[PDB]
Structure formats: C-alpha cells, structure tokens
C-alpha cells in the first residue's frame, strides 16, 4: 500500500508567479494522500469565498455545463468522475453541494474544489447544500477531521466560505439547478433573490427547505394529490408532489429541475415528465458511488450542451479503510 507524503505543499508550490494554482501538481499530490500547509489551505478557502461572495443566490448562465450530485468528501470518487466527465481545464462543471460529511476526505474535496473554482471560476460552479453548514459539520466527522488533519482555524474558514456559496442556478434560463428542490414560500425567482445567502441555514424556512426539499414518497402513483406536505422522512422541510412541481415550472416557464440530495442506484433518476413536453419535470443526480461504503450504487453526472442531455455513469473508486469517528 502507498504511503502519504509528510512534505506539505507550500504556497509558492501550489501557486505560480502568475498567481495561478497548479491543479496538476495538487492532483498528483492529493492522489498520494498528500496535505498542504495550513497557510496554503487557508488561502485557497479564503480566496474562494471572496469569489463566491460576489456571486448571486441564483446564478443565470446560458452555456453547456455538467451537473454533479452529492460528493460527501469522496475525493477518491471525485477524481474518477472528472476522468469520465472530462478535464475541468476545458470542461464546465457544476456541483449541487454536499461536498463534506460522510467521506473522511471532505477537506480534500473542498480544497480541490475551491482551487479549481479560483482557476476556472468561469467554467466551474459550486452550489451550497444542506450539508454546507456548521451545526451539521459539528455533528458529522467533518469538524473532527479538520481538527485531526489541520485545526479549528481551517474549519471556521470553510464555514464562513460556505455561506458565500450560491443557493441555486438557472442554466439556459430553462433548467433550475438546486440541492433539495422547490419551496412553498418561493413561487417566483424574485423570492429567491430576496433571500440571504451570507448566513447559516436555519432548521426551517424557505432557504432551508430548498436545501432539504424532497419529492413525495409517491412522486408517481399518488391518491391524495397534495401539493406540499411535511417531510416526516427527512425529519424536516416539506415534500413536493408531481402536480406541485409541474405548477411551479409552468408558472416560472421552466423546462426541468435538476438536483440531487437523493441517492440513486444508477447515479440518477427521472421523475414524471410534463404532459405537454416529453421531458422530465424533475431529475435527481448522484455522483457519490458506493454510498456509506455499503450500498453498491453507481454514480453519474448530467451534461447539457447544444440542446443535448448526456448522462455519464461511473462506478466507485478504490480507497483506504477508515474506522468510525477515527476510532
């Protein structure tokens, strides 16, 4: 088995004279289980937050981009994804959030994701997920990880940076990119713009729901026909039905809603399509293979370009074994 390099990469080692990061040098290092200097890591995080802070809650860009599902600090799975989806140097990617928690390599994902965003902030977009919070990071093994690998300094930095991440994005002003889904307190795009991103997600509300939003247990064979309902499964938020989403779309003249937050055995799942257009009203993307290291589910990413929706599927990747709570 390979051994992790004790030599930590320095700023001048990651960033060239032009101030541009060497994703090539970092990628190779990370692949060997290498870590960077506390100073460098803080620079990348802080540098990424500044850029995101300039972004709006709901970004609107008309261009071919590939949507990715939950990562769960699955760096080992993030490397393979880029291989199948293509190099980010000339390929536009879009994350739906959830880059930390679950995986014992959340730091590697955030660091690599942040560095890639600063290098190609016009081709790489990152959204905030229900996991992008402090309360959650404290409960999960994220906080402990940052303290075990680095310190509370890096953890706090990420938290403040995550608050700068976008909530949603309008791809081609037709598709809506989100983590959870629609919200009852949000029937228009303006409702989202009037939202506060620079802050922590509450246990409830519009911003929280969108991140915790989820389809009804029967987004198909429904008997009641309820639009919105309490999310008893997730233990919070609400649930949207086929008729509920179809109503919001028509009102907002949207094509489809691309998001994740829901694990899929095939890395993706298509929901009931519109009665008018032969397109799915909702779509779930999952880029986290072998969820919980138990399920043998596959991963995939949505690629929209030239009016073409290409779905790329991939299997899990090799990684070391880690005990629970780093026990």
């Amino acid at each position: 088995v390979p051994f992790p390099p004790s030599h930590r990469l320095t700023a001048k080692e990651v960033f060239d004279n032009d101030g541009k990061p060497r994703v090539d040098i970092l990628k190779a290092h990370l692949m060997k289980e290498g870590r960077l200097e506390e100073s460098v890591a803080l620079r990348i995080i802080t540098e990424g937050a500044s850029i995101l802070r300039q972004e709006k809650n709901l970004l609107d860009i008309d261009a071919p981009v590939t949507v990715c599902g939950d990562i769960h600090g699955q760096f080992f799975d993030l490397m393979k994804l880029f291989e199948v989806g293509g190099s980010p140097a000339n390929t536009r990617y879009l994350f739906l959030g959830d880059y930390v928690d679950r995986g014992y390599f959340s730091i590697e994902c955030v660091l690599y994701l942040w560095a890639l965003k600063i290098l190609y902030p016009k081709t790489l977009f990152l959204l905030r997920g229900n996991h992008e919070c402090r309360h959650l990071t404290e409960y999960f093994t994220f906080k402990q990880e940052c303290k075990i690998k680095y310190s509370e300094r890096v953890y706090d930095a990420c938290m403040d940076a995550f608050d700068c991440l976008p909530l949603a994005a309008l791809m081609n002003q037709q598709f809506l990119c989100v983590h959870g889904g629609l919200s009852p307190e949000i029937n228009t795009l303006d409702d989202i713009r009037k939202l506060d991103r620079f802050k922590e997600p509450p246990a409830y509300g519009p911003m929280c729901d969108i991140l915790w939003s989820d389809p009804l247990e029967d987004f198909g064979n429904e008997k009641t026909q309820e639009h919105f309902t309490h999310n008893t499964v997730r233990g919070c938020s609400y649930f949207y039905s086929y008729p509920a989403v179809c109503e919001f779309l028509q009102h907002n003249n949207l094509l489809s809603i691309l998001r994740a937050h829901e694990a899929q055995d095939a890395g993706y799942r298509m929901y009931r399509k519109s009665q008018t257009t032969g397109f799915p009203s909702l779509i779930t993307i999952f880029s986290a293979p072998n969820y919980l290291d138990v399920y043998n589910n596959k991963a995939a990413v949505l690629k929209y370009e030239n009016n073409v929706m290409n779905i790329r599927q991939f299997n899990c990747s090799p990684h070391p074994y880690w005990l629970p709570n780093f026990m």
Partner: peptide
C-alpha cells in the same frame, strides 16, 4: 420521448 436531443454512455462495470 424527449423532444430535444439526448444521449447516454455506458457504465464502468455492469453489476446486475
């Protein structure tokens, strides 16, 4: 079927 264009690639290792 999907009105617009749509494609799909193959997996990395069929399971079932």
């Amino acid at each position: 079927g999907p009105h617009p264009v749509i494609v799909i690639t193959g997996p990395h290792e069929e399971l079932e």
